[PDB]
Ligand binder design. Structure first.
Ligand code: HEM
Ligand code: HEM
Ligand code: XH8
Ligand code: XH8
Ligand code: H4B
Ligand code: H4B
Ligand code: ZN
Lengths: 411, 407
């Protein structure tokens, strides 16, 4: 079965054969599309075919499919599974798997970078202090004084689900949120629940609008522990506008390194519940979502007042007008401080080229339109006009429940 | 099987039961979502008829009444006898309103119950069709105070007697391809503009030439007609701050009147069913004016604003896009032609969604189409989870007549 996608701006038509190699389900049925739904302990029984599928992929990629090295590896894994109920990936396999997880990430516009990913193998880690050390090294390497480098740090895989390694932070670097008795929120509202946990675990909160949260680290199924990332290692950028001089007086800044820490990485049936990764920001993640979402810093009103827009009717598009200037400021600030960032035009254009290349060399590129299209200026980016097929390949990054909902407290 | 949708900006969760009534297919499977793809007989007829009549009769609180049963029997007899059946006026109106109500891609559906339906099933000729359309256009335009309306021509019979409006909208600007290699007018309408000329239209070869109607009655060859200019309301586009903007020489028409869709009610097919409401600002300012395969005016506007078009990261395109959209809204409002901004309209749709979930058990919605083509996440719809599914009666797409017409 062949599937065609059309760009309605260029008339380019592409043919997907890659979806045929798809296992995991979508949420959709022939009777319903769930494409805008946000989120729609394993026996040796189901483990070997998953191992086999991965290893077959891996050996095809290195042009060794059916080799004695291929076969002996399958054999080796099969035995280790029946002997131990799990298995260990070679370093080469771990690296290949991590990259491909990113490559298969249908919601990620940044995938043109997928082959350049520094893999830090942290599978010898045993303690939270151990995890901290690893994470610090990740942040320093990835930050590279503003010349950002994509990296992932991979802690030991799940075993019985009772000894999980987890990073409790959703991102390695993120700002605290504090609920005030008057109902208002100080700092990042998205992080209120987590901030409370930290406080309850002993964190002494500065209680400001941009307090970098402590790391909360769980090793081997033990209770999590608090560590403060060395400030010298947290690269931040003050936000100013190139023409508006009052913009600095808004008091805004952001951190340079987006480093997602709460996902689960799946490689050949193996589950890596602690696998923080980092790249660099697309400008709109901050300028549109973090700053302008109503449930986030929500700065549109204050910006619009200072610009003196007509705020009495929405039909003045005062919101659209202010949203742009904020995004201009984010981009300007980062570039001025020589910290890696990409605008939504450059990133979407690069994605189209990537996606086209993937169709030619790979027979497809699964992609989630709802997530790929930027949260401002949608149709003036080329992805808006691009038909996309969404399906799930392995290796993959998966969501997992927040650890505080599941963690068995040792006390 | 009972599905919940969450708004992530408000945490509000709605439960969907309505989707269980879904009949048509989506194009999606458990293995692949096609959410972003633009277009994924007697024994066939009576179940369709019955399903429709069941819901019609349920809506007026006479489900399982004799008048219900009797109607079912009447239509059932009529299908057996005639191989088709005719809709009562009451049913035709309910059906059209519900087709709109079920249009999962329409953000304006809060207005769905207020639809003027023009029964044009007695129409036999293209001149006849022309008369009906002029009447429709004039009613709907209402001197700039737009009223929603649909005009319904006779239903399909044997597919060889189809009524068709060849235009995609009742009102649209012509597209001419230049020896210069560029495109004059609306590039989306180039092919249709040729077919007009192929049929004898005398093009003024301008940039904003209102296209002639190309009307097909009873399967016959289509005829050309010029909508009386006095009936075509247009708006010159000026900026409330930039004087030079008027010099760009842009205008647009006030009446969005989609004419190429197929209306299906109780199994019956209405292949000529032009309908109209009013514009959301982004339709003209973002898509019509700023799409690359359209009027594509960004560069020219940006120049006039003197923005740094050197690097993408000055967001000059974004800046212009805003201003262009401000001007469209400003122009329509100043002239008192009905228009809605993307903020007002999406907020309205959230309310409508709430109503539909509360009173009907849900509301099919296509997030990809509902979210406006600019400023997406500063509108409430962006943060709104939606379930897309197909309910009937419905508006469907259908092939362009020239690819089908046995001349
Ligand atoms: C290097 C520059 C990168 C850029 C500019 C980029 C850009 C983005 C953006 C804008 C999103 C949307 C996320 C949101 O809006 O919440 C995203 C999603 C995602 N990215 Fe990338 N990314 C980059 C690198 C990476 C790397 C290194 C990985 C993993 C190794 C990755 C994996 C993912 C995944 C799994 C998602 C989906 C997240 C979710 O479902 O919540 N990306 N990316
Ligand atoms: C009265 C105010 C209305 C507003 C503001 C409105 C708004 C919109 C918008 C923005 C779209 C997206 C289409 C595009 O971007 O090309 C749309 C689609 C659609 N509308 Fe509405 N509309 C209105 C009235 C109506 C009426 C009266 C009908 C039919 C009786 C209707 C039926 C539809 C259908 C079937 C679609 C999807 C068609 C397609 O897939 O191309 N709308 N509407
Ligand atoms: N620049 C980058 C690179 C990679 C990224 C990976 C993930 C994310 C953020 N994911 C958003 C999840 C937020 C959420 C909220 C509620 C329910 N599900 C998810 C950003 C990245 N940015
Ligand atoms: N304001 C309104 C109201 C109703 C509308 C109904 C339809 C449309 C536009 N339809 C766009 C179809 C575009 C297309 C192009 C190529 C292939 N298939 C579809 C606007 C409305 N606006
Ligand atoms: C309901 C909807 O799926 C939700 O708002 C999505 C839409 N698209 C998105 N796209 C990106 N890149 N990031 C997001 O958080 C979201 N949120
Ligand atoms: C590829 C994608 O489906 C296509 O660009 C869609 C996206 N969303 C849209 N949304 C609306 N309202 N109108 C459109 O024409 C489109 N086009
Ligand atoms: Zn789907």
């Amino acid at each position: 079965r062949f599937l065609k996608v059309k760009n309605w701006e260029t008339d380019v038509v592409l043919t997907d054969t890659l979806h045929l190699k798809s296992t995991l389900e979508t949420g959709c049925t022939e009777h319903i599309c769930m494409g805008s739904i946000m989120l729609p302990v394993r026996t040796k029984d189901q483990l070997f075919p998953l191992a086999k599928e991965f290893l077959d992929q891996y050996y095809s990629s290195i042009k060794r499919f059916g080799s004695k090295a291929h076969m002996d590896r399958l054999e080796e894994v099969n035995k280790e599974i029946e002997s131990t109920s799990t298995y260990q990936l070679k370093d080469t396999e771990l690296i290949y798997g991590a990259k491909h997880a990113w490559r298969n990430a249908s919601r990620c516009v940044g995938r043109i970078q997928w082959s350049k990913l520094q893999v830090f193998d942290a599978r010898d880690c045993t303690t939270a202090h151990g995890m901290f050390n690893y994470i610090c090294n990740h942040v320093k390497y990835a930050t590279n004084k503003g010349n950002l480098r994509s990296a992932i740090t991979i802690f030991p895989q799940r075993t019985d689900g009772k000894h999980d390694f987890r990073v409790w932070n959703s991102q390695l670097i993120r700002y605290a949120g504090y609920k005030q008795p008057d109902g208002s929120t100080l700092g990042d509202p998205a992080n209120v629940q987590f901030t409370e946990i930290c406080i309850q675990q002993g964190w002494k909160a500065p209680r400001g609008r941009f307090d970098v949260l402590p790391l909360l680290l769980q090793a081997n199924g033990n209770d999590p522990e608090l560590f403060q990332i060395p400030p010298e290692l947290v690269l931040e950028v003050p936000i100013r506008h190139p023409k508006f001089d009052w913009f600095k007086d808004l008091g805004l800044k952001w951190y340079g390194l987006p480093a997602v820490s709460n996902m689960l990485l799946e490689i050949g049936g193996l589950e890596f519940s602690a696998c923080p990764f980092s790249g660099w920001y697309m400008g709109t993640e901050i300028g549109v979502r973090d700053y302008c979402d109503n449930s986030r810093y929500n700065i549109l009103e204050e910006v619009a007042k200072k610009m003196d827009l007509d705020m009495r009717k929405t039909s003045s598009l005062w919101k659209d007008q202010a949203l742009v200037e904020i995004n201009i400021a984010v981009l300007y600030s980062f570039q001025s401080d020589k910290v890696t960032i990409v605008d939504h035009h450059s990133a979407t254009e690069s994605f189209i080229k990537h996606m086209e290349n993937e169709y030619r060399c790979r027979g497809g590129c699964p992609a989630d339109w709802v997530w790929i299209v930027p949260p401002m200026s949608g149709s003036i980016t080329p992805v808006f006009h691009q038909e996309m097929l969404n399906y799930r390949l392995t290796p993959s990054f998966e969501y997992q429940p927040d650890p505080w909902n599941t963690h068995v407290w040792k006390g």
